[PDB]
Design a protein around this ligand. Structure first.
Ligand SMILES: [Cl-]
Ligand SMILES: [Cl-]
Ligand SMILES: [Cl-]
Ligand SMILES: [Cl-]
Ligand SMILES: [Cl-]
Ligand SMILES: [Cl-]
Lengths: 231, 231, 231, 231, 231, 231
């Protein structure tokens, strides 16, 4: 791994994938036991520890398809990671979706060219691993966390003058985020299992917005679901 | 409704959508009480009857995105249909898919341009309704029906000189059929609930063909599951 | 043929191709002698008989590029069909085009991706067989049927929120239909002769509209031209 | 008219359009009476004279879609030209096309983006005016001129590392030239009448070259036919 | 060279490339000594002479990517040309750009498909040869000619109903011309050095416009810069 | 500024943009006086200090078009930043590029869709500010720093199964990196000045790796040049 300063063996078979390396640090220190930091390259922290006896890693991915693609490719190809669960944030694009709602993404649309590069005329629809998604859905029931299950939009441009969020929302899309298409596509291509669990961090229609700090350290429900679903 | 010769009231709020109008006839006569044929236009038969007291319709769609789009648009827009369940077949493209398997499609890839026409540079990923999908999954598990949940590819060209099925299968796509992208996209755009349940007609990769018992068992299990997907 | 239940030999070298299998039945029973039905698979009727001593088949194609592609590929590749004449309907998109006008299509534009799948950056313009088109034009003069010769648009979406019919009409396009691009492309690729003869069934600008029954059984002029042109 | 230095009135309502302005000069001096040169801008000569009493213009267009688009737009929009007939050459791409053949183009494929710029996801198929084409065909047959009616490919790159001519020829395309898509599209958009008559300059596939008699005979027959295409 | 009637050796290693063959003639006769005309094919004049002891050719290219591509390919591949300097005109699309300003193009955007034909999903950005551009910039200082250095847009459609010049100007693009993308791409692909020096001939926003004659014979500053930069 | 936790005033009008926030820290502490950290959000550190009296900021951008787009948009739109200089690495793709070379990017190609989202059929070529580029070039030459001026490729996929680097290198592209298209496009759209200065991290083609002295010397020379690019 050009971008991960770890030795083979230091990363668990199951990895949680926030975009924010400081959230990775918060998750690891708040939820895991006997935490070791295996990566500090580019400040993109990665940690390994235990949750109720099961080994779990937590790896920052950065923002956007290209950043997450680097980390996910390295985790799969160099570290033999099997289960990859993004624990991210998203902007709500529908009135019925509220700030702090937890979303389980079945699939994601995108304006990244990554799949057109591979398929040309084909629209490739990425797909969550159903087993992971079902386990998350059951974990949410166990933990009393309401979840919304549906699709999201993986944006390349956070500030997009040509945004089609209005049409995407009319087509049922719940929220905008920046990573899921890459995670789902790369995991499937390599026969690994992926899922994106998202917390709504802001509402694109109303302007309601959580702070940087809130995003870093207060989205506890999605971590509860993620960790309970794998253990 | 240009293509459906029904009076208002004659179509139920839940419709099963086989591609073959003769299969529509067979489903209606085999599974429903007090069957009426509400459409003979173009020989694309549609029927309504009751299943355990509940009105259910069965409408042939024909083959391909443009044909199903006609029928689904008219069902949704002219008949206020709420739940739309495709019951059809696909050609399996992955070695791990057996011809005795029943597939619940979470999403579908396509070479249809219908979504590029709408979205341009955006790859739209159509999404099944999770409520219908989860009800189907539970119903399948309750009747010991081997079920796989994943994605399919909606082809425009049954005979395609430029087929990318090898790459699609590598990316995890289970099978090829000709309708799901349209059903899922149109239902979502109109806020209706859709699901595609697919039996395997043949194995495109291995060349394996079905037996009589497989055809009978998978078809019956598909209809059984479909009739337990709503509510 | 997966979709045609006929034995080699049962289909003539010359085939008329309505979209509606019930129109195929009407044509066969109304214009042909010693009619045999060689296909009932999916209710997509195909018939063979004689017109003034010449063997003629009439095969329903269904609606849309994918449906017609299935039938045309099978007719060419499995049944060695040589001359393929679509006898279809279209919606007028120009003021000067009237309901019940007969159109001979020189070529067709499309929003199907079928040719971009094959050619990428190339815009492939399908082309009628000039010999068939000339024979039709001369037949129309013989039978006293006015014809309009020009181009049509092969639509994937009968109900299209993103329709460019206004711009297409400004560019001279006469009408919208759902099959011609596929017929013309597939026939040329296989060295066979194709022509689309269309009757205007409705006017997209005025809203004038023939009934389902009228479409099924009253477009006699186009059949007269078609049959006279091959005999 | 930025690129044509003519006074109103100096250009006829019918114009022949060779690519080479020296061929324009040759056509005008060889076939027309009382010739005047109305344009010398950029050395792209245009001439007007009479053929059997009727005013006819001959305007060099240069090579490629952008160059002919300039001249055709100005002829149509500034000079109210009604009938526009390209008289040029193509490279034959099909074995069955001989270098002694004259081609009347029904339509043209292209790798130009001009129509995607206008239409996006739509493949626009440019269409010759059928009246001009049929007049040309009849004129050709009356003078025993071997004529083929079909489609051509309008190339942007005479030297193309990514040429698809093998596939184009398989799809029935007769030859390659550099102007017809633009002429046909622009004439139709403005409700004017166009046709392209093409001689074969060489055989791209077989490498066959023309002889003196072929060059003379095909050129003369092309001009003769062109001068009998209107009315 | 199919389009250049010269023998190897008759064209210099350094070639100036106006679009107008009459400007080529003006440049050659006005600035060069011992001028020979080596090409008259299609009236697209090409000349060779000396400027202060250095051999220089001046070759008309015609208008548009396809025309210039023909000439540039032949000059490189058949005549071993090393340095290619376009001396053209452009339309200003920004308020701060004035008529008769001389522009040195670093790069060019385009709506030609030529690079998508080669690269598909990749946006290829053509690039001036920095050595030639620096030499021109220093020559302009020596000769007292103000220059503007930036990017231009290579248009296929001089008359474009779908023009994006407003958005291009907002992105910093200086002017619209018809050749640079082809020159820069072809020179780089073949390891040769290219530069486009442009004079603003008209202002697209204000309507100010130089005459055909002014374009042909009065853009002396760009020739001064071009010639001084290579000698 | 969602992603930058700075007060108005804390960011300078000139910002250096390394991808790695730890390199941002290193640059600021090594080269600037009176350094303050103005951002810790997501661990994407940004610092401001003085260089020879002038306020200069150094902001980590992360990897890829979407990540840098976030930071650049916020710097430009919320902090009124005027000069933006990327200081980073690329993988060399041409045999004639040595790992000891420093590259000033005139433009960049990409497989990002960001500009097709904006422009559709237009290929937008991003362009460095020539004033900054020429200042950098002169500064490089004054310190005897081997500099190459040319284009780079902005990749979305560091690990790309469908890489076109062989063809890009043939077209003259020097190296591959992950940010420049976004920096150049966004700066130009907002009328700000940008440049990318790139060291070579490794040779993608030859496999050559850097030595300690090369890494140190190229990094120091890059920062030195950057700090002499404005004014
Ligand atoms: Cl967006
Ligand atoms: Cl396929
Ligand atoms: Cl439409
Ligand atoms: Cl070509
Ligand atoms: Cl334009
Ligand atoms: Cl790449």
């Amino acid at each position: 791994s050009v971008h991960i300063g770890a030795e083979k063996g230091q990363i668990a078979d199951t990895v949680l994938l926030p975009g924010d390396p400081l959230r990775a640090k918060f998750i690891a220190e708040t939820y895991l036991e006997n935490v070791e930091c295996y990566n500090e390259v580019r400040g993109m922290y990665g940690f390994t520890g235990t949750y109720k006896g099961k080994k779990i890693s937590v790896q920052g991915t950065g923002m956007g398809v290209p950043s997450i693609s680097i980390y996910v490719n390295e985790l799969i190809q160099s570290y033999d990671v099997q289960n990859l669960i993004r624990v991210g944030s998203c902007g709500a694009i529908r009135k019925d979706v509220k700030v702090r709602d937890v979303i389980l993404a079945m699939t994601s649309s995108t304006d990244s060219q990554m799949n057109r590069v591979a398929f040309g005329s084909v629209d490739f629809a990425p797909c969550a691993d159903f087993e992971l998604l079902k386990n998350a859905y059951d974990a949410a029931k166990d933990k009393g966390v309401p979840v919304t299950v549906g699709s999201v939009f993986t944006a390349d441009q956070f500030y997009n003058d040509d945004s089609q969020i209005e049409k995407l929302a009319k087509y049922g899309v719940l929220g905008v985020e920046m990573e899921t298409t890459a995670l789902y596509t790369l995991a499937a291509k390599h026969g690994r299992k992926a899922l994106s669990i998202l917390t709504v961090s802001d509402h694109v229609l109303t302007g309601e917005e959580t702070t940087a700090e809130e995003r870093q350290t207060t989205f506890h429900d999605m971590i509860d679901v993620a960790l309970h679903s794998v253990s």
